[PDB]
Amino acid sequence: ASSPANKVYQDRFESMYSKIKDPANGYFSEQGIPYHSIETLMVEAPDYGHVTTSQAMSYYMWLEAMHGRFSGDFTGFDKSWSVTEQYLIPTEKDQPNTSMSRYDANKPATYAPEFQDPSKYPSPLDTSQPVGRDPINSQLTSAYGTSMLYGMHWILDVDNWYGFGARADGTSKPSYINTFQRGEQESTWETIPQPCWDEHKFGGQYGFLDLFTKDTGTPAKQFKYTNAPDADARAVQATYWADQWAKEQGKSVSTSVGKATKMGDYLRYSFFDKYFRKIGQPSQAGTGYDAAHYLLSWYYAWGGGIDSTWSWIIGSSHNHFGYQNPFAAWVLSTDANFKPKSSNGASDWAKSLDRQLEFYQWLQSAEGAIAGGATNSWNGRYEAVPSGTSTFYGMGYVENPVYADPGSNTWFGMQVWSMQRVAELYYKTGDARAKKLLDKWAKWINGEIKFNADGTFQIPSTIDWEGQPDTWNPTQGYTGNANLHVKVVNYGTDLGCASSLANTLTYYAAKSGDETSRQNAQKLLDAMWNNYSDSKGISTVEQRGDYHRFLDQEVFVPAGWTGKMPNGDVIKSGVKFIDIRSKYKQDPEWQTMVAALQAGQVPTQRLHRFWAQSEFAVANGVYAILFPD
């Protein structure tokens, strides 16, 4: 039987759940897939509001798990997994096993350098550069009996807004698409959206392939997908809770547990260097696990031929603290129900749990906030790490891992998303490493929360950094990082970030007994409910400072390359963001946005992001369960 929950906060979870599932609100598509946001004029990570992301699906899982906890009905949780497998994990028609089974574990992929400016792409493949061997493929094919990968592709054009359709048909939905392809300086405003399944039917002569990669021969028709590791790890985390809560009620979500465990098994691909180069010795091809950094890197990607049979897989050399999930790592390495079928699954996750906690500690600034991360590939070309750069297991410290436009660790959101998982681990196990990280981090953030007399509040929005952490030495541990400092540049009222912050502080307060954390958490939840509630969940008016880029951001296109988007928009040198997405001019908010830009004002919007609304719903449920009185 489930323990008693605080009725006030449980009612708030239930109300939010109803608003989110309400057909009249429009959070979901006709096929039952959650959109990034109700509003369509939306550019920030995805570039259209009605795409879905693996991030959104993992939050949909978390929300349903919590609903099962309070309603005793888990059919909604099972459906969230059913929709995920059907639409976001490439089926056998999407990643043909005829091509995947031709994968060579001794030569996973061909090397190509990464560049610091989009104008340097396409990147040339070089078969002469070393690539290490993949030690886990044989464990996976043996356990699952297929060469296909079981992980979520990160983004999906749900209603076929771009027009690529399914597997080049131009009319089916949903449509697997990708955007980012050209390095750290390619922001969301600088991409050329392309289909994951490229048969050369759209774009240029060879589809969109030769805009990004250059091979010696003529480009082959091919498919390719990219995982967002933090999303798949959150799927495991949510499923573990669904399992606990269901068992407390004599119910079962067994089939969903099996899918989550399999997902966590394939997620181990994010533990490896991009081209399987030895960690700390980037010039050398790895011989197996010496190429594993054991952290959740920015991605793992795979692809292969459509017209011929071949395939490749790559991990990622770049690591950000914001993606780590020590809670998911503890579940997969210690809980018997979540033990992966592969021979080394549970043990690799046990190594990752230890490595991740060391990574967070190495990165903790003098004040408490967590710094960026590290990379095993300097400048994305395995260049020499400049002297004086501190390192973690041979990997050089990077202030803003992967992206510089804008910096990936300048947004406060990463702090709460990632520390929330540490709070859960601490709550369940009382781990000393987790406690040490949280005591300092929570002291830092509790001094940055500002409540106003009118009931509104502000938390850090944009942050900046100075210095670097001291080189990590595992036998000596944290030095205090006196030379690494965080600076809060400005404050804001991001409701998704505040809900995640409330969740983190609630788990931490329930275990540590810290009253300040508990009352700050409750004041954040009350403030949001009482002053930011609306008919669709919660919202506030926010400035869209980068929206001028719709009209003025030039998109790089190689000299002489011309092609067309499915709707006829011409892709060629000179185009702006809006030129290859002309359908946006039909958006209901378009004229309003443009009128503001014309008058020299910053456009504003009232947004209902799926992840933010679910975050607030879950934050209320966590509080109802941990503080029942």
Ligand X SMILES: OC[C@H]1O[C@@H](O[C@H]2[C@H](O)[C@@H](O)[C@H](O[C@H]3[C@H](O)[C@@H](O)[C@H](O[C@H]4[C@H](O)[C@@H](O)[C@H](O[C@H]5[C@H](O)[C@@H](O)[C@H](O[C@H]6[C@H](O)[C@@H](O)[C@H](O)O[C@@H]6CO)O[C@@H]5CO)O[C@@H]4CO)O[C@@H]3CO)O[C@@H]2CO)[C@H](O)[C@@H](O)[C@@H]1O
Ligand Y SMILES: OC[C@H]1O[C@@H](O[C@H]2[C@H](O)[C@@H](O)[C@H](O[C@H]3[C@H](O)[C@@H](O)[C@H](O)O[C@@H]3CO)O[C@@H]2CO)[C@H](O)[C@@H](O)[C@@H]1O
Contacts with ligand X by CB under 6 A lie at 45, 109-110, 112, 114, 154, 178, 180-181, 212-213, 215, 217, 220, 222, 224, 226, 228, 298-299, 301, 308, 310, 312, 314
Residue 185 binding Ca ion, by CB under 5 A: yes
Which partner, ligand X, Ca ion, ligand Y, none, binds residue 529 by CB below 5 to 8 Å per kind? none
Tokens linked to 43: 């550019």
586 exposure class (CB count in 10 Å sphere: 0-12, 13-18, 19+) = exposed
Work out whether 609 is an interface residue with ligand Y (CB under 6 A): yes
Pick from ligand X, Ca ion, ligand Y, none: which does 185 bind, CB < 5 to 8 A by kind? Ca ion
**Token output for 571:** 């892709």
CB 395 within 8 A of CB 401: no
Cβ contacts of 210-215, under 8 Å, gap ≥ 24: 210/122, 210/558, 210/561, 211/121, 211/122, 211/181, 211/557, 211/558, 211/561, 212/121, 212/122, 212/123, 212/181, 212/182, 213/112, 213/122, 213/123, 213/124, 213/125, 214/122, 214/123, 214/124, 214/125, 215/125
Site track 21-50 with ligand Y (rule: CB under 6 A), x = hit: -----------------------xx-----
Integer-rounded Cα radius of gyration of the chain: 23
Q: Which amino acid does the sequence have at 102? A: R
Q: Which of 144, 378, 393, 411 binds ligand Y (CB under 6 A)?
A: 411
Minimum CB distance to ligand X, residue 209 (Å): 7
Please choose which of ligand Y, Ca ion, ligand X, none residue 405 contacts, taking the beta carbon within 5 to 8 angstroms, the exact cut-off set by kind: Ca ion
Question: Tokens at residue 141, please?
Answer: 């094919």
Segment 52-71, which members bind ligand Y (CB under 6 A)? 55
Of 235-243, 290-298, 354-362, 398-406: span binding Ca ion (CB under 5 A): 398-406
Site membership for ligand Y, residue 413 (CB under 6 A):
yes
Q: 247 CB contacts (<8 Å, ≥6 apart)?
A: none
Q: What track of x and - describes contact with ligand Y for positions 542 through 581 (by CB under 6 A)?
A: xx-x------------------------------------
Q: Mapping DSSP to helix (H, G, I), strand (E, B) and coil, where does residue 267 land?
A: helix
Angle 326-334/345-362 helices, nearest 10 degrees? 150
- Rounded Cα gap, residues 76 and 74, in angstroms: 5
Residue for token pair 């040198």 = 573
Residue spans of alpha helices (H) in 478-604: 495-512, 515-532, 549-552, 590-598
* Residue 492 interacts with ligand Y (CB under 6 A): yes or no: yes
Neighbours of 206 (CB within 10 A): 16
Binding mask 140-179 for Ca ion (x = CB under 5 A): ----------------------------------------
Q: How far apart are CA 271 and CA 76, in angstroms?
A: 32
Number of residues that bind Ca ion (CB under 5 A): 3
Element (H, E) at 55: helix 54-71
- Give which of Ca ion, ligand Y, ligand X, none residue 314 binds (C-beta under 5 to 8 Å, depending on kind): ligand X
Measured from each CB, the residue nearest to ligand X is: 226
For ligand X, the closer of residues 70 and 111 by Cβ is: 111
Q: Is 454 an annotated catalytic residue?
A: yes
- Residue 213 contacts which entry, ligand Y, Ca ion, ligand X, none (Cβ below 5-8 A, type-dependent): ligand X
Interface mask (CB under 6 A) for ligand Y, residues 225-264, using x and -?
Answer: ----------------------------------------
Longest Cα–Cα distance in the chain: 69
Tokens coding 30: 């006709």
List binders of ligand Y among 495-514 (CB under 6 A): 496
Shortest spacing between CB 232 and ligand X, in angstroms: 10
Does position 546 bind Ca ion by CB under 5 A? no
CB under 6 A: which stretch of 118-126, 492-500, 553-561, 583-591 binds ligand Y? 492-500
Whether the ω angle into residue 603 lies within 30 degrees of 0, i.e. cis, is no
Q: Which stretch binds Ca ion (CB under 5 A): 186-194, 197-205, 284-292, 458-466?
A: 186-194
Residue 461, contacted partner among Ca ion, ligand Y, ligand X, none, CB below 5-8 A by kind:
ligand Y
Which residues on adjacent β-strands are paired with residue 391?
A: 396
Residue 62 or 74 having the CB closest to ligand Y: 62
Q: Is 404 in the site for ligand Y (CB under 6 A)?
A: no
Question: HEC string of 453-469?
Answer: CCCCEEEEEEEEEECCC
Nearest-approach distance from CB 117 to Ca ion, in angstroms: 8
Q: Which is nearer to ligand Y, 294 or 547 (CB)?
A: 547
Query: Two tokens at 379?
Result: 């400048």
Tell me if the bond preceding 406 is cis, omega within 30° of 0.
Answer: yes
Least gap, CB of 226 to ligand X (angstroms):
3
- Distance in angstroms (rounded) separating the CA atoms of residues 514 and 427: 13
Instruction: Characterize 290-322 residue by residue with b for buried, 16 or more Cβ atoms within 10 angstroms of its Cβ, and e for exposed.
Output: bbbbbbbbbbbbbbbbbeeeebbbbbbbbbbbb
Q: How far is the CB of 116 from ligand X (least distance, A)?
A: 12
**In this structure, what are the phi and psi dihedrals at residue 585, rounded to the nearest 5 degrees?**
-65, -15
Residue 405 found at the interface with ligand Y (CB under 6 A): no
Rank residues 8 and 602 by Cβ distance to ligand Y and give the closer one: 602
- Pull the structure tokens for residue 174: 């949903």
By a kind-dependent CB cut-off of 5 to 8 A, residue 59 interacts, out of Ca ion, ligand X, ligand Y, none, with none
Q: Is 587 in the site for Ca ion (CB under 5 A)?
A: no
Minimum distance from CB of 604 to ligand Y (Å)?
A: 8
305 sits in which H/E element: strand 301-305
Q: Which of 232, 418, 425 is nearest to 335 (CA)?
A: 425
Q: Which of 22, 199, 405, 464 binds Ca ion (CB under 5 A)?
A: 405
Catalytic residue, chosen from 198, 335, 454, 552, is: 454
Cβ-contact 128, 175 below 8 angstroms: no
Strand 213-214 relative to strand 570-571: parallel, antiparallel, unpaired?
unpaired
Under the binding rule (CB under 6 A), the answer on residue 393 touching ligand Y is no
State the binding partner of 462 from ligand X, Ca ion, ligand Y, none, CB within 5 to 8 A by kind: ligand Y
Q: What is the DSSP letter of 33?
A: P
The two beta strands, 373-375 and 391-392, are: unpaired
Give me the least distance between CB of 409 and ligand Y, in Å please.
Answer: 11
Q: Taking a C-beta distance cutoff of 8 angstroms, is the pair 381, 113 a contact?
A: yes
Residue 447's CB is within 10 A of a number of other CB atoms, namely 11
Partner in contact with 472, chosen from ligand Y, Ca ion, ligand X, none, beta carbon below 5 to 8 Å by kind: none
Give me the least distance between CB of 63 and ligand Y, in Å please.
16
Catalytic (active-site) positions: 454
Which stretches of the chain bind Ca ion, using CB under 5 A? 185, 187, 405
List contacts with ligand Y (CB under 6 A).
Answer: 44-45, 55, 411, 413, 461-462, 492, 494, 496, 542-543, 545, 609
